[PDB]
Design a protein around this nucleic acid. Sequence first.
RNA 1: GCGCUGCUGCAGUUGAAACGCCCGUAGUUGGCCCCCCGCCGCCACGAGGAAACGGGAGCGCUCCAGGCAGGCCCGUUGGAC
Lengths: 129, 258, 170, 165, 153
Amino acid sequence: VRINVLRDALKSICNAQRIGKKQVIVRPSSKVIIEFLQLMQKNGYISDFAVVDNHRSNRIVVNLIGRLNKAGVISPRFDIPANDIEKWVVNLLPSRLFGHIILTTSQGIMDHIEAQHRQIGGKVIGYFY
Amino acid sequence: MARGVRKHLKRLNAPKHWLLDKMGGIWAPRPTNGPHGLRECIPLILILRNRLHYANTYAETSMILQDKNVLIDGKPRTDPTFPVGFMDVFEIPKVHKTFRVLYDVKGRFTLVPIQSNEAGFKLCRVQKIFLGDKGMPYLSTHDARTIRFPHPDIKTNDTIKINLKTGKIDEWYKFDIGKIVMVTGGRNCGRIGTIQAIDKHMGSYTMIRMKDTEGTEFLTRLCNVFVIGNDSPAVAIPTTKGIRPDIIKNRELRLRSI
Amino acid sequence: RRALERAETLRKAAYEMAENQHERAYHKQSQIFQGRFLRKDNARCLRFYKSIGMGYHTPITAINGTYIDKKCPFTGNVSIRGRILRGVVHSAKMQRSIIVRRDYLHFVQKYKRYERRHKHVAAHLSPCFRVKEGDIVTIGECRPLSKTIRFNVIKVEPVSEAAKKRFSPF
Amino acid sequence: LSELEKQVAGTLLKLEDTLYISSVKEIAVDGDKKAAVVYVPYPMLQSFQKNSEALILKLEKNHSGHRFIIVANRTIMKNAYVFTGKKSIRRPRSRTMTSVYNCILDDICYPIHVIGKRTLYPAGSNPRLQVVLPKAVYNEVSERTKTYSAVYKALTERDTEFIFM
Amino acid sequence: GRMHSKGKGISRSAIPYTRAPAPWNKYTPEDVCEQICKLAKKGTPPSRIGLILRDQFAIGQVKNVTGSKIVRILKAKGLAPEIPEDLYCMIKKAVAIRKHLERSRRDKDSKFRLILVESRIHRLARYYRQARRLPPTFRYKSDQAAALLATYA
RNA sequence: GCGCUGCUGCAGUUGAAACGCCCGUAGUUGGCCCCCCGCCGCCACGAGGAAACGGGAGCGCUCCAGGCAGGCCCGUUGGAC
Ligand SMILES: [Mg+2]
Ligand SMILES: [Mg+2]
Ligand SMILES: [Mg+2]
Ligand SMILES: [Mg+2]
């Protein structure tokens, strides 16, 4: 059965971007998907998107610009102590200069840079570069 | 499982704030029972030998104590292992030196020289009010001193001023918000501050919040909060008014002294 | 008039008990001095009860009941002190005792995951409380009452039967 | 408790030849024209909605200066459960904020039924919701899109816009 | 067809986006409610009731007219059955299979199907026992299924 | 060393290895939705609680392994954390 909607959405996004398309459709929308896409947009990776209301698990349409290189999720959301982020950065990201790691905290969904700025920790959701 | 009480003390198992050297020897002095317990006291010989440097060995300290050259609250003590504690009086008449035992910001015992106007008394913290034989009310203090027939207005955790000459109360300080206090245990030993909040948790410890004069705020449990007067201290305090510096500031001080 | 009805009801319970010859001994409340029941006026209290404190209130059943239990926290001679815990009822087959189920989590650092664990805790249940399997109870600590019992029930929150057994840490 | 109320009451007394209205709200629009909202208590909304278009046109013609709209007054609660200390109190879903806003949007243009909704998330601009209306009405309502957007922004801070499809 | 099979069909119905009644609708909530009374009195399952209403009276969705579902209306009128319809039909099918089997004790595919149907019945009965839709004492026994079927109908 | 015990991080068509198939309890995992209430997990801070070992500030036992010292006008010299 369907479990992780975000994983399906990200896989579809990468599949479409691989063959140089311009628009993708994701079926089951959700708040977490919307925040993930908002962060991606803010960092300049996927331009804009729209949500279509059908009264049943709204759909969503996104527009690409051939900048995204890889996106993914960590299924069992482990807890990241505020001082245990550099290990994950080294393990997951190509470099310490570019790339982002998404965490959910009591203060909301934020990039790992922001969490390092505020010296707090939380749970890991995904990553992209 | 030992068959009886313990009489020795290994050097490594001794309290840290005594500052004994690791290689000084295998053993350390074992304080005898008295006004203060093992973990909130310090033996007399350590003061007489490793601090004032008046003696170089155990035998010299024993001879000095036998000659009755040291007074502790006006009563000569001949025990090299007599425990000394907070808010004690340490006067040596033969050299006209009088000190009061207090805590430094770092959390160690210190000797603060005093004057004669305030050297005839001591401050005591009341921990218990109980009925003794025949229903006569009593009270006990942190230095193991019991007083009969006290004023009803005195309650627990208050502070009491007893004259050493006779041993009678003259006045007391209530435990309330806005009274200067001194911390006698934990991570905040030696700090001075003023009470700002009192939060009581049913069936568990009561927490006391006080603010330092500079503006710092810290928390500690009521078991080691000692009132030392109203607004201003009743007794003398070390040069620094209970202000703990940070590591950087302490390093700057060390470099300046070097 | 309300107090008068209570005293009569309490008085009957004492005299119908003396007609239960099957019992080996006569069970009584230690605090009350037998002899007050010979007074026709209601000038004396016939039943003893206390408040355990900690914000819990005494059930009306204990105050108006007609039962004797020296291990009850309200009408007996025990005191509550220490830790207060919660759990669900696992079995209620003994005379005045039950088995309580507690659930918690254990973390394993190597695998960065958890385990679900449970323990069984036996407690004393006073007649003032009615309990079936699955209900939530609050237990307070007391002195050793038996080989395995060191807790006493203080509060019962009913749960519907047929409900799904679920992992419920408390 | 004002001046427009007497005028609307007079109109209502003229129209018949047993209802009652809670209050009146006036919203400004970019142009000199303004908008007025008549608050009909919830149980009588369906009573007012039988002849809403006729009432609105008669009210507009009798008194000009701003357009008239009819919307019900619904309360909003802010706790899914309310802990009284003993039992539990649950908020009905009809009192949620999301349902109320949708009901308001439906009521603002009652005669025409919304065929779709879409919310855009531009790269930098604030997200805005655009609705979809039947192609038939088109110009029959094209002169009230600005006022509709203004009122929807006023009652609910969510900005919007209109298209036809 | 997935729980007890390998099929992956996707035949369903798609209801409209708008929840409003049809413009040509000429029925109030009372008139339809009386219609359910007559149909229910005659002994008809809610699904067939909806079929009849949609076909004969041209009512695509009862909810859009009355604001409530059929079984809710019946319960408000105190006419809903004690045993939900789907479980009742499951039990009917099981009884029919059991009769055919006791007629002949060499068909094994029938036994297979009986196993599947009984498993489904047990699952649904457990779900209904939870949520307090059925008496806690409710239990399904194959030996006396026909009798209760007759009474509970 | 060994990603040849694999949580990070193995393999299962042919090299070793998918139960003959179905039902099914315990167990594990379970779509979307209400901004603010209660509880559980989670994050941060804090209190309380031995040192020695480990890290670490300062000091020229001739250096070093080490130790807590030394000169003088010494933070109340220091042994901080
Ligand atoms: Mg299956
Ligand atoms: Mg399918
Ligand atoms: Mg082969
Ligand atoms: Mg092989």
